[PDB]
Design an enzyme around this catalytic site. Structure first.
Site, PDB file in Angstrom:
ATOM      1  N   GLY A  16     146.894  28.731  24.003  1.00  0.00           N
ATOM      2  CA  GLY A  16     146.991  29.934  22.357  1.00  0.00           C
ATOM      3  C   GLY A  16     147.253  28.929  21.852  1.00  0.00           C
ATOM      4  O   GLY A  16     147.667  27.565  21.610  1.00  0.00           O
ATOM      5  N   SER A  17     147.138  28.861  20.236  1.00  0.00           N
ATOM      6  CA  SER A  17     146.950  28.535  19.255  1.00  0.00           C
ATOM      7  C   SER A  17     146.986  29.407  18.345  1.00  0.00           C
ATOM      8  O   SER A  17     147.064  30.376  18.122  1.00  0.00           O
ATOM      9  CB  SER A  17     146.014  27.437  18.774  1.00  0.00           C
ATOM     10  OG  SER A  17     144.853  28.014  18.957  1.00  0.00           O
ATOM     11  N   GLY A  18     147.176  29.302  16.984  1.00  0.00           N
ATOM     12  CA  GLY A  18     147.807  29.882  15.233  1.00  0.00           C
ATOM     13  C   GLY A  18     147.807  28.381  14.422  1.00  0.00           C
ATOM     14  O   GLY A  18     148.152  26.982  14.875  1.00  0.00           O
ATOM     15  N   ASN A  19     148.529  28.843  13.380  1.00  0.00           N
ATOM     16  CA  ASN A  19     148.901  28.388  11.992  1.00  0.00           C
ATOM     17  C   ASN A  19     149.915  27.666  12.442  1.00  0.00           C
ATOM     18  O   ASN A  19     150.417  27.212  11.560  1.00  0.00           O
ATOM     19  CB  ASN A  19     148.654  29.766  10.866  1.00  0.00           C
ATOM     20  CG  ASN A  19     149.094  28.430   9.848  1.00  0.00           C
ATOM     21  OD1 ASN A  19     147.764  27.371   9.590  1.00  0.00           O
ATOM     22  ND2 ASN A  19     149.913  29.040   9.358  1.00  0.00           N
ATOM     23  N   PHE A  20     150.805  27.746  13.345  1.00  0.00           N
ATOM     24  CA  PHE A  20     152.329  27.075  13.927  1.00  0.00           C
ATOM     25  C   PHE A  20     151.851  26.222  14.698  1.00  0.00           C
ATOM     26  O   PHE A  20     153.272  25.271  14.373  1.00  0.00           O
ATOM     27  CB  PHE A  20     152.810  28.280  14.642  1.00  0.00           C
ATOM     28  CG  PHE A  20     152.185  28.875  15.882  1.00  0.00           C
ATOM     29  CD1 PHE A  20     152.342  28.567  17.348  1.00  0.00           C
ATOM     30  CD2 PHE A  20     151.434  29.828  16.090  1.00  0.00           C
ATOM     31  CE1 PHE A  20     152.023  28.268  18.031  1.00  0.00           C
ATOM     32  CE2 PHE A  20     151.150  30.435  17.047  1.00  0.00           C
ATOM     33  CZ  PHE A  20     151.402  30.040  17.993  1.00  0.00           C
ATOM     34  N   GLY A  21     150.473  25.718  15.148  1.00  0.00           N
ATOM     35  CA  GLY A  21     150.503  25.237  16.637  1.00  0.00           C
ATOM     36  C   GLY A  21     149.974  25.752  17.457  1.00  0.00           C
ATOM     37  O   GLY A  21     149.095  25.933  17.698  1.00  0.00           O
ATOM     38  N   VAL A  23     150.333  26.636  22.264  1.00  0.00           N
ATOM     39  CA  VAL A  23     151.610  26.955  22.843  1.00  0.00           C
ATOM     40  C   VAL A  23     151.065  26.686  24.398  1.00  0.00           C
ATOM     41  O   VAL A  23     149.494  26.888  24.785  1.00  0.00           O
ATOM     42  CB  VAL A  23     151.308  28.346  23.116  1.00  0.00           C
ATOM     43  CG1 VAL A  23     152.094  29.560  24.388  1.00  0.00           C
ATOM     44  CG2 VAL A  23     151.713  29.661  21.849  1.00  0.00           C
ATOM     45  N   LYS A  40     155.602  27.771  22.943  1.00  0.00           N
ATOM     46  CA  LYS A  40     155.319  27.782  21.022  1.00  0.00           C
ATOM     47  C   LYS A  40     155.680  26.377  21.595  1.00  0.00           C
ATOM     48  O   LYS A  40     157.187  26.193  20.923  1.00  0.00           O
ATOM     49  CB  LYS A  40     156.074  28.408  20.854  1.00  0.00           C
ATOM     50  CG  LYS A  40     155.307  29.423  19.405  1.00  0.00           C
ATOM     51  CD  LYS A  40     155.224  30.762  18.970  1.00  0.00           C
ATOM     52  CE  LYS A  40     154.870  30.733  17.896  1.00  0.00           C
ATOM     53  NZ  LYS A  40     155.103  31.843  17.159  1.00  0.00           N
ATOM     54  N   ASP A 132     154.000  43.804  14.861  1.00  0.00           N
ATOM     55  CA  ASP A 132     152.639  42.902  14.928  1.00  0.00           C
ATOM     56  C   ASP A 132     151.788  44.044  16.343  1.00  0.00           C
ATOM     57  O   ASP A 132     150.849  42.594  17.468  1.00  0.00           O
ATOM     58  CB  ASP A 132     152.897  41.628  15.309  1.00  0.00           C
ATOM     59  CG  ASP A 132     151.532  40.359  15.083  1.00  0.00           C
ATOM     60  OD1 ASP A 132     149.802  41.580  14.792  1.00  0.00           O
ATOM     61  OD2 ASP A 132     151.564  39.789  14.897  1.00  0.00           O
TER      62      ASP A 132
HETATM   63  C1  LIG Z   1     144.582  33.107  30.532  1.00  0.00           C
HETATM   64  C2  LIG Z   1     145.785  32.777  30.248  1.00  0.00           C
HETATM   65  C3  LIG Z   1     146.211  32.622  28.785  1.00  0.00           C
HETATM   66  C4  LIG Z   1     147.398  32.656  28.144  1.00  0.00           C
HETATM   67  C5  LIG Z   1     148.066  32.683  28.685  1.00  0.00           C
HETATM   68  C6  LIG Z   1     149.691  33.019  27.853  1.00  0.00           C
HETATM   69  C7  LIG Z   1     151.019  33.579  28.891  1.00  0.00           C
HETATM   70  C8  LIG Z   1     152.299  33.513  27.696  1.00  0.00           C
HETATM   71  N1  LIG Z   1     152.782  33.967  28.690  1.00  0.00           N
HETATM   72  C9  LIG Z   1     154.064  33.774  27.501  1.00  0.00           C
HETATM   73  C10 LIG Z   1     154.283  33.658  26.990  1.00  0.00           C
HETATM   74  N2  LIG Z   1     153.062  33.327  25.686  1.00  0.00           N
HETATM   75  C11 LIG Z   1     151.894  33.637  26.197  1.00  0.00           C
HETATM   76  C12 LIG Z   1     151.458  32.706  25.323  1.00  0.00           C
HETATM   77  N3  LIG Z   1     151.514  32.871  24.536  1.00  0.00           N
HETATM   78  C13 LIG Z   1     149.396  32.184  23.730  1.00  0.00           C
HETATM   79  C14 LIG Z   1     148.513  33.370  23.901  1.00  0.00           C
HETATM   80  C15 LIG Z   1     149.300  34.695  23.143  1.00  0.00           C
HETATM   81  C16 LIG Z   1     148.851  36.000  22.450  1.00  0.00           C
HETATM   82  N4  LIG Z   1     149.300  36.718  21.470  1.00  0.00           N
HETATM   83  N5  LIG Z   1     149.888  32.774  27.124  1.00  0.00           N
HETATM   84  C17 LIG Z   1     148.236  32.746  30.104  1.00  0.00           C
HETATM   85  C18 LIG Z   1     147.493  32.704  30.400  1.00  0.00           C
END
Ligand SMILES: Cc1ccc(-c2cc3nccnc3c(NCCCCN)n2)cc1
EC number: 2.7.10.2
Length: 268
Positions: A16-21, A23, A40, A132
């Site tokens: 994932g991603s966002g304004n912070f950077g 994941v 993150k 949120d």
């Molecule tokens: C296909 C897929 C996509 C994302 C994740 C995943 C797992 C995570 N587990 C713990 C903490 N953060 C996580 C994260 N953060 C980014 C998405 C933030 C959404 N609000 N993504 C796993 C599988």
């Protein structure tokens, strides 16, 4: 204390991603086994004081939580950037999962939203407000196991008040009327958000209030109108959504009542 950067290995996979950077997926060496983690990572080598302060506040909240239906923080690492290391929920966000899996049965959706209500009942008991709550901020460990994530806006309530008064992100579509009009966030406003989350889940990850501007959503809610019942959504679950969208804060149920309603419906 801080995690040891040398015990963390980051993979190239972006979650994932966002304004912070961003994941990223990674692995962290525990006392013996190696554990799969989501990390993150602040952009620009954590130059921004605001992003740093926010990450530490997020970590501070997560350090105090211990519940099966909430994402666990492993720790924080100060290295090439600032990093928040969490146990990975490997199926990812609930909204995206349901979008891709329309075969998921109504009983399964009820199970997952009940789990979210258990995590929120714990958060309410702990006197933290999430601020949120939304289907994109529920992560799936498995198709039958949900965890609440994304504590970047969460607040520890004062001992003498049941709300936080905001002085950033403004997800209007998930916010209760008192949030919009008086900037007051409580476990009751999290309940309103949970109602929207239920609507999202039974709509297989559809965005709420589609095509509407924030101002139009606020006006709609002010005149007593609400989103309709999703196709195939059990009536009892839509009735609960409407209860979560009770305009009056005092009359709106808390999470103990919401969790109990879900518990009973799930067990017939
Ligand atoms: C296909 C897929 C996509 C994302 C994740 C995943 C797992 C995570 N587990 C713990 C903490 N953060 C996580 C994260 N953060 C980014 C998405 C933030 C959404 N609000 N993504 C796993 C599988």
């Amino acid at each position: 204390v801080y995690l040891d950067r040398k015990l963390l290995t980051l993979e190239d996979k972006e979650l994932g991603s966002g304004n912070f950077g961003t994941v990223k997926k990674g692995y962290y060496q525990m006392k013996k086994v190696v554990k799969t983690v989501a990390v993150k990572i602040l952009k620009n080598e954590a130059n921004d004081p605001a992003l740093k302060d926010e990450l530490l506040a997020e970590a501070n909240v997560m350090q105090q939580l211990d519940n099966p239906y909430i994402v666990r923080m492993i720790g924080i690492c100060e290295a090439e950037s600032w990093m928040l290391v969490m146990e990975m929920a490997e199926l990812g966000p609930l909204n995206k999962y349901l979008q891709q899996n329309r075969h998921v049965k109504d009983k399964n959706i009820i199970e997952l939203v009940h789990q979210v209500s258990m995590g929120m009942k714990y958060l309410e008991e702990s006197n933290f407000v999430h601020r949120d709550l939304a289907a994109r901020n529920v992560l799936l460990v498995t198709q039958h196991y949900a965890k609440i994530s994304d504590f970047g806006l969460s607040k520890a309530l004062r001992a003498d008040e049941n709300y936080y008064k905001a002085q950033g992100k403004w997800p209007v579509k998930w916010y209760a009327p008192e949030c919009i009009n008086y900037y007051k966030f409580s476990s009751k406003s999290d309940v309103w958000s949970f109602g929207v989350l239920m609507w999202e889940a039974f709509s297989y990850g559809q965005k709420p209030y589609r095509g509407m501007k924030g101002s139009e959503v606020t006006a709609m809610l002010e005149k007593g109108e609400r989103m309709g019942c999703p196709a195939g959504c059990p009536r009892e679950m839509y009735d609960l959504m409407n209860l979560c969208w009770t305009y009056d804060v005092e009359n709106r149920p808390g999470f103990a009542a919401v969790e109990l309603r879900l518990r009973n419906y799930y067990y017939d």
